[PDB]
């Protein structure tokens, strides 16, 4: 077990890590094992004086607060986004750009960004007058909740991984993490992208030059959003598993809607689904525009990511056997 797990974890710096195999091999602890590997590799325990027992205790706690029964928004997704961010952070164009604290912020934000996800959308929560939507005034409901939980868990026994940061570091990290996780609200996508394009238009290189907090945080926001929307850029055997999981989750929401006598939301009706066509639409309207812009920012570092993305689009287009794609996109990715 241990040797096989270690062998898989050798790919932690690679796009296309076998994250589902890691989940199986670790006894459903992919987030804990991947985070621990990354913190060791980046020397973050030493830099920030994080006790190893504290790190593991926090990670296990965090991982426990992802719902294993939610098909997509679970601990495997969190582990995937962490690992993807870890790879993006090492892209040559960004070499030496970010401080260790910024790195820690991006990785921690990735780890917590979907914690305690119930497997239904912000719009479902709002439309049902849910407790969470009442608590958060309909505004980035889940994302505010993920932050609140991810930070609160630091307060459990032997969980405060930031205990040896300075006051200023802790404040800065908290501000960056909030900014990053709030940017994972899918409704902010079009604004984030528009703003990234504008950044790319005026970029300075020596390797990217980022002079101010605003530019740095913008890049980290987009980096983690790209990681969150990275599934179609992965090896096809991985991508297809992510598709199958998100559709299962969506169809479960639709089943809840049906039981409540609600109109079934776009993409959530197992009786009227077009999985392949819907992925093509996702790539054409959302994922390709985003990744083409990231690739411009880090040119030429992300070329292989784009090539894969285009191959995968073709595969889905080729296996096709409306209002829905269009309605889903409008309701999901616009403010
Ligand atoms: C490849 C797995 C995957 C991931 C995502 C990303 C995503 C994550 C979360 C949400 C919000 C929500 N409803 O929970 C919406 C989209 N979207 C999709 C998808 C699936 C069908 C159609 C479209 Cl346009 C997109 N497919
Ligand atoms: Cl795998
Ligand atoms: Mg989310
Ligand atoms: Zn708890
Ligand atoms: Zn996510």
189 counts as catalytic? no
The tokens 């890049």 sit on which residue? Answer: 219
Q: Which two tokens stand for residue 41?
A: 């590799």
**156 backbone φψ class: left, alpha, beta (φ>0; ψ -120 to 50):** beta
For residues 311 and 332, what is the distance between their CA atoms, to the nearest angstrom? 25
Running DSSP on this structure, what letter comes out for residue 28? S
Is 145 annotated as a binding-site member? no
Q: Which two tokens stand for residue 13?
A: 């710096």
For residues 123 and 250, what is the distance between their CA atoms, to the nearest angstrom? 12
C-alpha closest to that of 184 among 142, 242, 237: 142
For residues 72 and 267, what is the distance between their CA atoms, to the nearest angstrom? 14
Phi, psi of 102, rounded to the nearest 5 degrees: -65, -40
C-alpha closest to that of 108 among 135, 158, 157, 146: 146
DSSP-derived secondary structure for 232-249: GGS-HHHHHHHHHHHHHH
Is 113 annotated as a binding-site member? yes
Is 211 annotated as a binding-site member? no
Judging by beta carbons within 10 Å of its beta carbon (0-12, 13-18, 19+), is residue 317 exposed, middle or buried? middle
Please give the distance, rounded to the nearest whole angstrom, from the Cα atom of residue 244 to the centre of ligand 4.
28
Contact 59, 158 (CB under 8 A): no
> Which DSSP helix (H) or strand (E) runs through 251?
helix 236-259
Angle (CA) 205 207 209, round 5°? 50
Alpha carbon nearest to ligand 1 atom 11, residue: 121
25: CB partners within 8 A, 6+ apart? 1, 4, 5, 8
DSSP-derived secondary structure for 113-157: TTTT--SS-HHHHHHTT-HHHHHHTTSSHHHHHHHHHHHHGGGST
244: CB partners within 8 A, 6+ apart? none
Please tell me the number of the ligand nearest to residue 234's CA: 1
Residues with CB under 5 A from ligand 5 (ion): 114, 228
Is 231 annotated as a binding-site member? yes
Q: Which two tokens stand for residue 104?
A: 């820690």
Q: What is the resolution of this structure in A?
A: 1.7
Alpha carbon nearest to ligand 1 atom 23, residue: 282
> Which DSSP helix (H) or strand (E) runs through 280?
helix 275-282
For residues 183 and 181, what is the distance between their CA atoms, to the nearest angstrom? 5
Please tell me the number of the ligand nearest to residue 17's CA: 2
For residues 154 and 59, what is the distance between their CA atoms, to the nearest angstrom? 10
Residues with CB under 6 A from ligand 1: 121, 186, 231-232, 242-243, 246, 267, 278, 281-282, 325, 328-329, 332
Judging by beta carbons within 10 Å of its beta carbon (0-12, 13-18, 19+), is residue 201 exposed, middle or buried? exposed
The tokens 């411009």 sit on which residue? Answer: 296
Domains, in order of start, for the chain:
1-335 (1.10.1300.10)
The tokens 């894969």 sit on which residue? Answer: 308
Please give the distance, rounded to the nearest whole angstrom, from the Cα atom of residue 114 to the centre of ligand 3.
5
DSSP-derived secondary structure for 38-92: HHHHTTHHHHTT--HHHHHHHHHHHHHTS-TTSSSSSHHHHHHHHHHHHHHHT-G
For residues 267 and 249, what is the distance between their CA atoms, to the nearest angstrom? 10
Q: Which atom of ligand 1 lies nearest, measured to the CA of 325?
A: 24
**43 backbone φψ class: left, alpha, beta (φ>0; ψ -120 to 50):** left
Alpha carbon nearest to ligand 1 atom 2, residue: 243
C-alpha closest to that of 187 among 118, 135, 149, 141: 141
Please give the distance, rounded to the nearest whole angstrom, from the Cα atom of residue 19 to the centre of ligand 2.
5
Please give the distance, rounded to the nearest whole angstrom, from the Cα atom of residue 143 to the centre of ligand 3.
6
Q: Which two tokens stand for residue 238?
A: 């991985």
Count Cα neighbours of 138 within 13 Å in the Cβ-side half-sphere.
7
């Amino acid at each position: 077990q241990e040797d096989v797990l270690a062998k898989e974890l050798e790919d932690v710096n690679k796009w296309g890590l076998h994250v589902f195999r890691i989940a199986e091999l670790s006894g459903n602890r992919p987030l804990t094992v991947i985070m621990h590997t990354i913190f060791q590799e980046r020397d973050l325990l030493k830099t920030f004086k994080i006790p190893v027992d504290t790190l593991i205790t926090y990670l296990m706690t965090l991982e426990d607060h992802y719902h294993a029964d939610v098909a997509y928004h679970n601990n495997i997704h969190a582990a995937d986004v962490v690992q993807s961010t870890h790879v993006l952070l090492s892209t040559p164009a960004l070499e030496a750009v970010f401080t260790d604290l910024e790195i820690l912020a991006a990785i921690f934000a990735s780890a917590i960004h979907d914690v305690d996800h119930p497997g239904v959308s912000n719009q479902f929560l709002i439309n049902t007058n849910s407790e969470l939507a009442l608590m958060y005034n309909d505004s980035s409901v889940l994302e505010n909740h993920h932050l609140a939980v991810g930070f609160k868990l630091l307060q459990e026994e032997n969980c405060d991984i930031f205990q040896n940061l300075t006051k200023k570091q802790r404040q800065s990290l908290r501000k960056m993490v909030i900014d990053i996780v709030l940017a994972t609200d899918m409704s902010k996508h079009m604004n984030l992208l528009a703003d990234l394009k504008t950044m790319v238009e005026t970029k300075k290189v020596t390797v990217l030059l980022l002079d101010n907090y605003s530019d740095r945080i913008q890049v980290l926001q987009n980096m983690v959003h790209c990681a969150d929307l990275s599934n179609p850029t992965k090896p096809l055997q991985l991508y297809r598993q992510w598709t199958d999981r998100i559709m299962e989750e969506f169809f479960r929401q639709g089943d809840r809607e049906r039981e409540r006598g609600m109109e079934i939301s776009p993409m959530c009706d197992k009786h009227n689904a077009s999985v392949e066509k819907s992925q093509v639409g996702f790539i054409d309207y959302i994922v390709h525009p985003l990744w083409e812009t990231w690739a411009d920012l880090v040119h030429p570092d992300a070329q292989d990511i784009l090539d894969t993305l285009e191959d995968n689009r073709e595969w889905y287009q080729s296996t096709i056997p409306g209002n829905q794609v269009s309605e889903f996109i409008s309701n999901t990715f616009l403010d």
